[PDB]
Ligand binder design. Structure first.
Ligand SMILES: Nc1ncnc2c1ncn2[C@@H]1O[C@H](COP(=O)(O)OP(=O)(O)OP(=O)(O)O)[C@@H](O)[C@H]1O
Ligand SMILES: Nc1ncnc2c1ncn2[C@@H]1O[C@H](COP(=O)(O)OP(=O)(O)OP(=O)(O)O)[C@@H](O)[C@H]1O
Ligand SMILES: [Ca+2]
Ligand SMILES: [Ca+2]
Lengths: 275, 393, 136, 167, 174, 341, 277
């Protein structure tokens, strides 16, 4: 019986198993009386105490690589070298699920919808999960939103009213790459990921790059994997290749975005617990 | 600017219009338009307000239902006279503040902007949310201004219990009440039908409307009120007169129980509505209880009235009492079934209620802030009508 | 920031990559000699389908266009019907190119030619105009 | 006219050939689905652009792709009053693009109005009817614009008379 | 909401599931004698004009069933009083009307059969019919002094006006 | 014989061995299975697992297994356990949508075409208890729209948006062995490109091998139908059509094809082996707002009985939600002028 | 409504309600109102010194000095007599009504108050209509800047008086619609051969006469039958509203087009939805 307790939802069930037999809401955890194999975040207080990034890579049948786990409160970039993780080289991005949902609420309120951040939080989160996605080329997305109506989807609110969501579908998740959009100092999951790896052994740097695996509910946005790749190719070009367009072809960036990555951590423990 | 902005509050039964800065609208007219039922200039042959109610050769239309614009052609023309006949304002020289029903769509705001910008070339437009204006109007009673409160807007169509948190309406917690000035008039009309004679059939509604506005009030207890009347009819039965428009004759009737029975339907909807039975105090309670825990006491402590049908003497007192009882009863039963601190319930009533929204909009449109949050014509041509989807509080 | 201004896809290696004209004298001669149907055929001979020069393509276009203008309304059908399918197809592409340069009233006549080409090649001949990777 | 029927006939035939679409998941972005004619991120999925012109002013541009088609119309505008009437009318409809699901919010540069018909439209609507619509639309806007022009003129005359006869 | 009886004692007797409430009357019947200066008939008459507008009524005590019965019956009396000219005439007809065999719980014609318990046997039947008749007689007698304005031959319009309204949309004649 | 399952599109379909049940995708994430009862259709199952539109469905006859692929990048193999169908995930390892799928005739493999510009040959290892796959990549340069197996379960024809029809070897020695030489070539290592059409225009919507496998045909967006004959140095016969593009095709005899597309009706094409030329002899649907059975594009066609060597009944599903059944001989006696071979 | 009314409704109703109550014997209510009129006119109705028995009506026109230069004060005095008092600071003319001393025909003075603006304009017209009649030629033109960027020029000649308007069309498309309306004015005598003749020039004057693609010059030629003592008033009522009359109709014209557009668009959506199975 493996149980991965997450900040916002709880995933638990059995070994050898396929997907959590039970997935239900948690708010005791944040990124004990209330609280009352197990998983642990990339910087759990020793005072508080398997590593999740370790479990993720494990389910993939890997021992080395970088894990981008984005859930409800915080996003982590956890590099793991043959066997165990390495806190040093592990970073955080103070942007994840809640922030995107909160941002969507603001955006929908700007277009003229009477949403209340507290009262309608759960409602908009569902809108986020059903309609939001990551833009590959924002410039391109902007044109579609401004010049056509292909992006407009209808959503029926609990009271029966119907609202319309368009450009905001990709605008909210853009927070992940442009923190300033939601008043957050930082560089964006992609640029963050880049640095994290560059700040590593030139020997392993190549091994890591070709082993970036996603994990968590916030990594499910359609297009996320492609946006990351385009972002990394860009950074690499500008910063590592200085600008030689011919070498870009040598950048081997494979971003493992497994079908069951939403709950990849659990998927691990399970299998990692028959062994 | 040297000229004050135009402030227009269109409603199901009446449209309040005037210039920012004034304490009361310069005109309050029926939201109706009379036309002939297009080539030449036939589209201009029309009247609005009172002049359009009795036209022999014209058909009266009501562009607004349940508080929302149903006929844009007609609403647009209605504006033509609102601007050029009544206000007598050069539309290109004045900023305009209009109001909207809660839950007005973004689409509808663009339709209004299209009219105001594309037809009248106004230099600036602001579409205000009625409830917020009502909240602001109440500051005229309350020494600590706040935009968090529960608004009770009761006009002629339907009545709304609108919760407002920090200037922003919590739309998913709004509740409607199938009782309003229109329902109350019809009810009083029936009471008179059963008792008084001589009322000219064509003036039946008219007479009921009069009795309602001139003699009604809300009592604290039905049987006790009924007893005062039977025990001393001399001090409670009034007289109302009028004249038969088709006999010139004069007609008077005794006005009785209808005085307090009329408003009573807000509290006992079943008296006149077979499908609704929730007392207004309960609807309010339910609404607030549906809002976030953190905002509940501030909502209970600031229940503001707005609209013609909230004018009945003692409407606020009754509402406050009944709501307190419900609340006290609940907190008591939970202390028993088990220490919930007592909740402060307060219904605000003020002189500026018959046109609370208009007054709210007037005070806002005459402040420097306003001329900034308003969307200009420049920003309209460049970014499009979408800019009018949101109107900063 | 600044690294997003560069469209890396530009240099992507998976991206797809696609793999002289008629006898002026030949044509004028058939025209001069009144051999209309022969002129159409001569003009539809050896199209610039493989040259990167919009210039030579334009000459080919002008040559073909010239012929189509010369024709007398009541003769267009007979001529079109003499062409095989590959021919009608090509004719259709030249007719669409003509549409891109209205002159005097050239468009009025091009529409009549389109009626005829359509009649002989069917809507499928238009399809092949849109589908062509190498064109006039 | 003598030239209107041939023009609409050539246009109709072209729309029929271009309105042959199917659902196409993006090859460039993981789990995306976009009107290829708009993003143009895969050359092979784009068809050749074609134009049908009635004359030097009136023309239609048809851009096809595997899952979408953009149709742009250059509306007849004989004089100034027609130019502004056409522009207001096109803007009017474009503001309502959402209810007119096959309308583009803005026209392709050089045209007065544009349509963006996708496989989702040819899926939930009979494609031959969408073709009819485009042709029907072309014919009706000219009529409407003519009516508007007569209307403005008609009312202007009465307005001038009403004021003058009162002196 | 509606007005409820407060005369239910911890030792009030029952006839069916109705409360056998005391009344000050001279008419015959099983009604207990009333000492206080207020009985269930006075209560029902004092509340009439208010209760009659109601449509929904929650039954709490078996006393409420007695109160409801008299309320519906008051309507009946008004129907009759409306068409007569003189307190005396009305007095006559309040006796006649009080004597008529109205339907009782369990029978067709008695509205509210789902609410009132049917007499369990012949004794309860006779006793029940007896209590209601007694209630009708006393009610109609008191109702007369109220309806007629001291300017006799004048059933006040302040009572007549209620003739068309029906408590809970029910009628003892429907 | 036309039947309407819905008014929205039937994205794709697959019939069981007895043609007793038909599986269709109602333009969504699900697959509904319908069983015929008398002259009526009854819904009996609903495979709900994909999280995107299902794009391909194939039913292995003997093992009675259904395989589906979708825009969610996944493929599930479906096994009927007693009363309900249970899905088994298949990691395709593709970063784009799956577009089509087909079980090999030997029922030990299945190929999936995708927007990743690759073809994933999947097979089951009864040792680790799951499905794994190998990718055929070169020289595919765009989305693979259609696939069709050669009767030897090794050669595989594919159509793609790079305007080509190709024949590859999908030899997987872990479940079968060295195939007998074929007129297409004698050397067939996994991924070997056996044949590539020579056209630089027209997305190849459908491909199809004949019964014996010596011939392969395909239909493209340039409104043309083609057939390559391996018994003739792989010479390709071509026929341009006067109408809209065909989306599907299948042999019905060794020298006859039936295709359907945006014209919304089936047509016939015949191959003259001696002259190496294709001819139109079609328009089998002889007479909304159309004179055709289907009221929108036909995107799939399958042989119901008689095989591709002598088909007697074939099926068509389209974007109008309709499913039609055509009887070859009935069509022959109804259209006296009809050929067939 | 085709012709624009001349009197101000806010003024009349505010005074009427007040007179009504004064006559009835009720105690006066405090009154404080700010409102406008076309041409940048601003009004103020109030109780001077908070004395509710007194109601003042003031009007402010940025161009009053120009009207004053042409007889304004003298005319306003003739019309208002004792009601006209010292202008309220910030305004040019103020009328004062003593609720305790009203005339027999209250309604008559309510009407004249309603015409305060029109009466301020009246004199420039009477002055020149008078010149023309006494045959006094050569007198200098009158220039009234009724709007920050629009001007009216009045001049008398031997047999006619001319009134020229220099108007501006903000929205460029409004110029086109404008030209259409002016063309009908231009050909007006085809409807009323005795009516004033109208001339129209676009972008070019018929002084500091400006020039511009958005400036339009309308010229009205008034004849003795339009300017004599008998028609003078009606003529003034019409002429001083022309400019606003023109822009009002241009705007109502666009309103009408919208109704057309709503019907046509609505039609198209019907046809489109009929394409759905
Ligand atoms: N399909 C989806 N697309 C985008 N976001 C999603 C999707 N599904 C869930 N989410 C979001 O993912 C978050 C929950 O993911 P997850 O359960 O991995 O986080 P957690 O473990 O509860 O919290 P934490 O990762 O901080 O410990 C929420 O913000 C939820 O709204
Ligand atoms: N003093 C009064 N007492 C009770 N009712 C009054 C009084 N004065 C006016 N009313 C009623 O107020 C109603 C009009 O109120 P109001 O103008 O606020 O509503 P509205 O905006 O026209 O309609 P709605 O708010 O429903 O869209 C009418 O029923 C009128 O009879
Ligand atoms: Ca987690
Ligand atoms: Ca209102």
């Amino acid at each position: 019986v493996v149980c991965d307790n997450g900040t916002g939802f709880v995933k638990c069930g059995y070994a050898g198993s396929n997907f959590p037999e039970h997935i239900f809401p948690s708010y005791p955890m944040e990124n004990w009386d209330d609280m009352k194999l197990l998983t642990e975040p990339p910087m759990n207080p020793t005072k508080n105490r398997a590593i999740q990034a370790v479990l993720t890579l494990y389910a993939q049948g890997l021992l080395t690589g970088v894990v981008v786990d984005s859930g409800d409160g915080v996003t982590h970039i956890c590099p793991v070298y043959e066997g165990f993780s390495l806190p040093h080289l592990t970073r955080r991005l103070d942007i994840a699920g809640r922030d995107i949902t909160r941002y969507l609420i603001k955006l929908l309120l700007l277009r003229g919808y009477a949403f209340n951040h507290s009262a309608d939080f759960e409602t908009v989160r569902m809108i986020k999960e059903k309609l939001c996605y990551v833009g590959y080329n924002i410039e391109q997305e902007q044109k579609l939103a401004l010049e056509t109506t292909v992006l407009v989807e209808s959503y029926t609110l609990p009271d029966g009213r119907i609202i319309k969501v368009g450009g905001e579908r990709f605008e909210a998740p853009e927070a992940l790459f442009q923190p300033h959009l939601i008043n957050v100092e930082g560089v964006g999951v992609a640029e963050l990921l880049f640095n994290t790896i560059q700040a590593a052994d030139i020997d392993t740097r190549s091994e890591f790059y070709k082993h970036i695996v996603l994990s968590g509910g916030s990594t499910m946005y359609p297009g996320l994997p492609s946006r990351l790749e385009r972002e990394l190719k860009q950074l690499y070009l500008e910063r590592v290749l200085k600008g030689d367009v011919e070498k870009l072809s040598k950048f081997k960036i494979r971003i493992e975005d497994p079908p069951r990555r939403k709950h990849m951590v659990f998927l691990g423990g399970a299998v990692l617990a028959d062994i | 600017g040297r000229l004050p902005a135009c402030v227009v509050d269109c409603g199901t039964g009446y449209t309040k219009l005037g210039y920012a800065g004034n304490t009361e609208p310069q005109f309050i007219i029926p939201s109706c338009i009379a036309i002939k039922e297009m080539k030449g200039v036939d589209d201009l042959d029309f009247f609005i307000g009172d002049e359009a109610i009795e036209k022999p050769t014209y058909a009266t239309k009501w562009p607004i239902r349940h508080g929302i614009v149903e006929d844009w052609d007609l609403m647009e023309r209605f504006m033509e006279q609102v601007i050029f006949k009544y206000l007598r304002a050069e539309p290109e020289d004045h900023y305009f503040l209009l109001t909207e029903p809660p839950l007005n769509t973004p689409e509808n705001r663009e339709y209004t902007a299209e009219i105001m910008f594309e037809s009248f070339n106004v230099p600036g437009l602001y579409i205000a949310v009625q409830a917020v204006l009502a909240l602001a109007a109440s500051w005229t009673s309350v020494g600590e201004r706040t935009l968090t409160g529960t608004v009770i807007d009761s006009g002629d169509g339907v009545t709304h219990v609108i919760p407002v948190a920090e200037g922003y309406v919590i739309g998913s917690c709004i509740k409607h009440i199938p009782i309003a000035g229109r329902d109350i008039t019809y009810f009083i009309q029936q009471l008179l039908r059963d008792r008084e004679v001589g009322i000219p059939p064509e003036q039946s509604l008219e007479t009921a409307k009069a009795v309602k506005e001139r003699y009604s009030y809300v009592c604290p207890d039905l049987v006790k009120e009924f007893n005062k009347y039977d025990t001393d009819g001399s001090k409670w039965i009034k007289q109302y007169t009028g004249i038969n428009a088709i006999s010139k004759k004069e007609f008077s009737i005794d006005v009785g129980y209808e005085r307090f029975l009329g408003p009573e339907i807000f509290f006992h909807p079943e008296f006149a509505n077979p499908d609704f039975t929730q007392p207004i105090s309960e609807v309010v309670d339910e609404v607030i209880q549906n809002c976030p825990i953190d905002v509940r006491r501030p909502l209970y402590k600031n229940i503001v009235l707005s609209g013609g049908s909230t004018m009945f003497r003692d409407f606020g007192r009754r509402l406050q009492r009944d709501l307190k009882r419900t609340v006290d009863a609940r907190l008591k039963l939970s202390e028993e079934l088990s220490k919930p601190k007592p909740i402060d319930v307060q219904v605000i009533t003020h002189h500026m209620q018959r046109y609370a929204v208009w007054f709210g909009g007037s005070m806002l449109a005459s402040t420097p802030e306003f001329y900034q949050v308003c969307h200009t014509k420049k920003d309209y041509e460049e970014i499009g009508p979408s800019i009018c989807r949101h109107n900063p509080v | 920031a600044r690294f997003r201004k560069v469209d890396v896809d530009e240099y992507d290696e998976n991206k797809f990559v696609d793999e002289a004209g008629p006898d002026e004298g030949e044509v004028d001669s058939c025209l001069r000699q009144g051999n209309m149907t022969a002129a159409l055929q001569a003009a539809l001979k050896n199209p610039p389908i493989n040259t990167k020069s919009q210039a030579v393509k334009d000459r080919a276009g002008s040559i073909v266009l010239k012929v189509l203008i010369s024709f007398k309304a009541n003769d267009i059908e007979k001529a079109v019907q003499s062409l095989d399918k590959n021919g009608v197809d090509l004719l259709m592409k030249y007719i669409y190119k003509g549409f891109e340069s209205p002159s005097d009233n050239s468009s009025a006549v091009l529409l009549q030619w389109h009626e005829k080409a359509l009649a002989a090649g069917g809507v499928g001949s238009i399809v092949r105009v849109l589908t062509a990777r190498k064109t006039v | 006219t003598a030239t209107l029927r041939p023009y609409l006939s050539a246009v109709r035939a072209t729309l029929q050939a271009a309105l042959c679409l199917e659902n196409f998941s993006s090859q460039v972005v993981e789990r995306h689905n976009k009107p290829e004619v708009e993003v143009r991120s895969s050359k092979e999925l784009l068809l050749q652009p074609v134009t049908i012109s009635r004359n030097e002013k009136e023309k239609v541009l048809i851009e096809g792709s595997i899952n979408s088609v953009r149709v742009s119309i250059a509306v007849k505008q004989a004089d100034e009053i027609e130019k502004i009437l056409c522009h207001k009318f096109m803007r009017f409809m474009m503001m309502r693009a959402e209810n007119f699901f096959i309308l583009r919010r803005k026209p392709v540069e050089g045209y007065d109005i544009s349509f963006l018909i996708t496989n989702f439209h040819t899926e939930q609507m009979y494609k031959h009817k969408l073709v009819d619509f485009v042709i029907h639309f072309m014919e009706e806007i000219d009529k409407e614009i003519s009516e508007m022009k007569l209307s403005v003129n008609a009312r202007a005359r009465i307005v001038a008379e009403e004021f003058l006869k009162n002196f | 909401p509606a007005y409820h009886s407060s005369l239910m004692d911890p030792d009030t007797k029952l006839i069916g599931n109705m409360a056998l409430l005391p009344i000050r009357s001279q008419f015959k019947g099983p009604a207990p004698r009333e000492t206080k200066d207020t009985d269930i008939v006075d209560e029902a008459i004092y509340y009439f004009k208010a209760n009659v507008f109601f449509k929904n009524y929650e039954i709490k005590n078996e006393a409420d069933r007695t109160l409801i019965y008299i309320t519906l019956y008051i309507s009946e009396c008004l129907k009759k009083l409306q068409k007569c000219n003189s307190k005396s005439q009305g007095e006559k007809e309040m006796y006649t009307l009080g004597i008529t065999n109205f339907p009782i719980p369990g029978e067709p014609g008695f509205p509210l059969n789902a609410i009132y318990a049917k007499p369990a046997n012949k004794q309860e039947d006779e006793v029940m019919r007896a209590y209601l008749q007694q209630l009708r007689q006393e009610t109609g007698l008191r109702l007369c002094e109220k309806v007629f304005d001291p300017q006799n031959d004048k059933p006040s319009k302040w009572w007549t006006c209620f003739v068309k309204r029906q408590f809970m949309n029910k009628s003892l004649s429907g | 014989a036309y039947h309407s399952f819905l008014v929205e599109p039937i994205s794709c379909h697959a019939w069981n061995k007895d043609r007793t049940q038909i599986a269709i995708c109602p333009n969504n994430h699900e697959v509904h299975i319908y069983e015929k009862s008398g002259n009526k259709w009854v819904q009996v199952h609903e495979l709900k697992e994909h999280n995107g539109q299902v794009t391909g469905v194939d039913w292995a006859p003997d093992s009675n297994r259904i395989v589906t692929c979708g825009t969610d990048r996944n493929a599930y193999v479906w096994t009927l356990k007693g009363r309900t169908w249970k899905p088994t995930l298949v990691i395709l390892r593709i970063n784009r949508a799956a577009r089509c799928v087909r079980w090999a005739p030997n029922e030990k493999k299945f190929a999936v075409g995708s927007g990743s510009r690759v073809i994933s040959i999947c097979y089951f290892e009864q040792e680790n208890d799951w499905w794994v796959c190998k990718h055929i990549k070169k020289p595919i340069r765009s989305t693979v729209l259609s696939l069709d197996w050669h009767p030897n379960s090794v050669l595989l024809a594919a159509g793609s948006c790079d305007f080509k029809c190709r024949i590859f070897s999908a030899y997987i020695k872990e479940v079968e062995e060295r195939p007998a030489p074929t007129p297409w070539g004698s050397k067939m290592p996994f991924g070997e490109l056996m044949f590539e059409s020579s056209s630089s225009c027209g997305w190849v919507h459908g491909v199809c091998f004949s019964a014996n496998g010596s011939r392969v045909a395909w239909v493209s967006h340039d409104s043309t139908v083609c057939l390559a004959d391996a018994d003739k140095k792989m010479a390709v016969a071509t026929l341009a059509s006067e109408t809209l593009p065909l989306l599907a095709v299948t042999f019905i005899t060794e020298s006859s094809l039936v295709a359907a597309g945006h014209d919304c009706f089936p047509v016939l094409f015949t191959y003259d082996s001696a002259a190496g030329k294709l001819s139109f002899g079609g328009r089998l649907d002889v007479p909304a707002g159309l004179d055709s059975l289907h009221k929108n594009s036909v995107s799939q066609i399958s042989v119901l009985s008689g095989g591709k060597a002598k088909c007697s009944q074939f099926c068509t599903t389209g974007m109008d939600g309709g499913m039609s059944i055509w009887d070859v001989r009935s069509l022959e006696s109804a259209l006296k002028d009809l050929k067939i071979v | 409504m085709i012709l624009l009314e001349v009197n101000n409704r806010i003024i009349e109703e505010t005074l009427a309600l007040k007179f009504e109550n004064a006559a009835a014997g009720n105690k006066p209510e405090a009154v404080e109102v700010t409102f406008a009129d076309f041409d940048g006119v601003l009004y103020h109705i109030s109780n001077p010194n908070g004395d509710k028995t007194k109601v003042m009506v003031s009007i402010s026109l940025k161009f009053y000095k120009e009207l004053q230069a042409h007889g304004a004060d003298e005319l306003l005095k003739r019309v208002y007599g004792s009601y006209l008092v010292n202008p309220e600071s910030g305004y040019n003319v103020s009328l004062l009504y003593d609720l305790e001393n009203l005339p027999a025909s209250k309604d008559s003075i309510v009407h004249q108050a309603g015409m305060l603006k029109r009466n301020c304009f009246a004199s420039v017209f009477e002055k020149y209509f008078q010149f023309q009649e006494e045959g006094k030629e050569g007198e200098n033109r009158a220039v009234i800047h009724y709007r920050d960027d629009e001007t009216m020029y009045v001049e008398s000649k031997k047999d006619r008086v001319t009134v020229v308007f220099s108007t501006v069309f903000k929205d460029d498309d409004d110029v086109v619609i404008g030209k259409v309306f002016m063309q009908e004015f231009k050909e007006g005598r085809r409807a009323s051969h005795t009516a004033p003749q109208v001339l129209f020039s676009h972008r070019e004057p018929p002084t500091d006469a400006a020039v511009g693609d958005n400036i339009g010059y309308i010229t009205f030629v008034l004849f003795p039958r339009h300017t004599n003592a008998s028609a003078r008033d009606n003529t003034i009522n019409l002429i001083h509203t022309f400019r606003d009359y023109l822009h009002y109709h241009i705007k109502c014209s666009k309103a009408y087009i919208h109704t057309r557009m709503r019907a046509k668009t609505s039609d198209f959506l019907k046809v489109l939805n009929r394409a759905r199975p």
